[PDB]
Structure 1
Amino acid sequence: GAGMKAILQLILEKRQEFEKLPCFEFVRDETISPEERLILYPCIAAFALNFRDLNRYDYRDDNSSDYYQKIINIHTQEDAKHWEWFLNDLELLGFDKTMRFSEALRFVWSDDLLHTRRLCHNIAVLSHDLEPVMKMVVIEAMETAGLVIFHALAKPGESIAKATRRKYLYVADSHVEVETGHAVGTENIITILEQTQLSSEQEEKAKEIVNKVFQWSTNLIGEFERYVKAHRSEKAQPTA
């Protein structure tokens, strides 16, 4: 009934708040070079391969006969390939820097990237005892936040891609388009959710999920904002 409807409206409310965070104002500001606006890019290293593992090992259950878990398995197979795109654009942007192994470790495990590093961990802990329909709410919330980020990042990414004549794959419109999903075959999760009735217990759990996902995503964006503030003298060094 109007249980699911409330949950999907809560996601749109939270997306509308999330869209207005100062980090996105900065990322969208075409008066600052695109190379300066992507100086947060290396921070995603603490998230992107954790997100691959969340998809491979936490969301996925290859043995499930459950209708909803099978839809999750198809979607998370594709979403788990995007880490290679991250590493592709890391190199194009000049951020694939030579350093000591320990410097890479100290960067990823920085206290200034705690919320970035633990977002997938938090989702796995939230997700551990959820039935597949409730896992679909986690994924839909996480993917809604992710689409806001990549719709913003693709703005300077596409400006650099065009200017350098280089194919960007992660901070790129192609990432946003394949992530959204508009292909013949298996339905989008949002289509399934639109057609599913929530019990009162499921509705309270779904509100908790949506509030947590958006809080943890906001915590991650806060760390990107403080990293940028500490590096405005620095820029991406793409070559043509």
Structure 2
Amino acid sequence: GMKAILQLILEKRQEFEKLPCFEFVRDETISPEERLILYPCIAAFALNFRDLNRYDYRDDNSSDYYQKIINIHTQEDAKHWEWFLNDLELLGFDKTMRFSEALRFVWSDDLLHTRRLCHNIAVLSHDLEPVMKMVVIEAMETAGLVIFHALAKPGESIAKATRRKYLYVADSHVEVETGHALEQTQLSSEQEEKAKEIVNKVFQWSTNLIGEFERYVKAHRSEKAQPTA
């Protein structure tokens, strides 16, 4: 029911768009430096997402038409972790700390959902046939696009004011993810119900992650980005 599945992704996307967090990130009455205090939280996700694309999504030896399309997709997505580290530096969040402080931060109970999003997608897709992996990926990329559409607003305000090139919370990342977020497909009967479960899970896990970002902003509300012009 590829029309239904996509219709569900569209419906889920329309709910995801309205989470409080994105209301806050899109609010031009608040300094862009404060709207980006969630940024160091993505550390629990960005490099795990690199690994999901490199080691879980990708099966380089496949003749499957859907798998080949996934493979090209994974090539692009697996480079964005360096963009994350680029803007971590620009935003003043790449602070000197003890090795153990870094580990305790990434493995915080407060970042459980952020850290385990890629893990859950790994467990969810490890036995799926290529066409079903594409539903997983399309759901996940739709949620990614919503988040980066939001983050790119305070990101580009800082970039222009400081005259620096941002790569991660920036229109150029939204541009690549736009192409990523085919339709000539008819799913077996129980596949359609499988795909509905995929879409519900990816969006539920994505919601839980934004949940933690909101909580972290609350709890670390003075810890605003410190970019330099």
- Cα shift at 1:175: 0.1
Counterpart CA distance in 2 for 1:181 and 1:219 is: 25
Counterpart CA distance in 1 for 2:89 and 2:223 is: 16
Gaps of 5+ in 2: none
1:112-145 C-alpha deviation (Å, 9 max, x unpaired): 0000000000000000110000000000000000
CA contact (8 A) 2:73 2:180 kept: no
Counterpart CA distance in 1 for 2:152 and 2:88 is: 14
**Runs (4+) off by over 4 Å:** none
Structure 2 counterpart of 1:218: 207
- Cα shift at 1:182: 8.4
Counterpart CA distance in 2 for 1:203 and 1:216 is: 20
Tell me the secondary structure at the aligned position of residue 92 of structure 2: coil
Task: Tell me whether 122-131 or 226-235 shows the greater mean CA deviation.
Answer: 226-235
Counterpart CA distance in 2 for 1:237 and 1:110 is: 23
Structure 1 counterpart of 2:219: 230
1:7-64 C-alpha deviation (Å, 9 max, x unpaired): 0000000000000000000000111100000000000000000000000000000011
Tell me the secondary structure at the aligned position of residue 229 of structure 1: helix
CA contact (8 A) 2:144 2:177 kept: no
Counterpart CA distance in 2 for 1:7 and 1:80 is: 26
Counterpart CA distance in 2 for 1:234 and 1:133 is: 43
Structure 2 counterpart of 1:22: 20
- Cα shift at 1:103: 0.2
Counterpart CA distance in 2 for 1:151 and 1:45 is: 19
Counterpart CA distance in 1 for 2:85 and 2:191 is: 38
Counterpart CA distance in 1 for 2:11 and 2:4 is: 10
- Cα shift at 1:179: 1.6
CA contact (8 A) 2:113 2:209 kept: yes
Structure 1 counterpart of 2:192: 203
Counterpart CA distance in 2 for 1:135 and 1:195 is: 16
Structure 1 counterpart of 2:148: 150
- Cα shift at 1:203: 0.1
TM-score, normalised to structure 2's length? Answer: 0.99
Length, aligned pairs only: 229
Gaps of 5+ in 1: 184-192
- Cα shift at 1:194: 1.1
TM-score, normalised to structure 1's length? Answer: 0.94
Counterpart CA distance in 2 for 1:180 and 1:208 is: 24
Structure 2 counterpart of 1:38: 36
Change (3 A) 1:182 1:24: closer
- Superposed CA RMSD in Å reads 1.2
Tell me the secondary structure at the aligned position of residue 232 of structure 1: coil
Tell me the secondary structure at the aligned position of residue 51 of structure 1: helix
1:131-179 C-alpha deviation (Å, 9 max, x unpaired): 0000000000000000000000000000000000000000000000012
Tell me the secondary structure at the aligned position of residue 99 of structure 1: strand
Counterpart CA distance in 2 for 1:61 and 1:234 is: 41
- Cα shift at 1:234: 2.2
1:191-225 C-alpha deviation (Å, 9 max, x unpaired): xx311111111101000000000000000000000
CA contact (8 A) 2:113 2:205 kept: yes
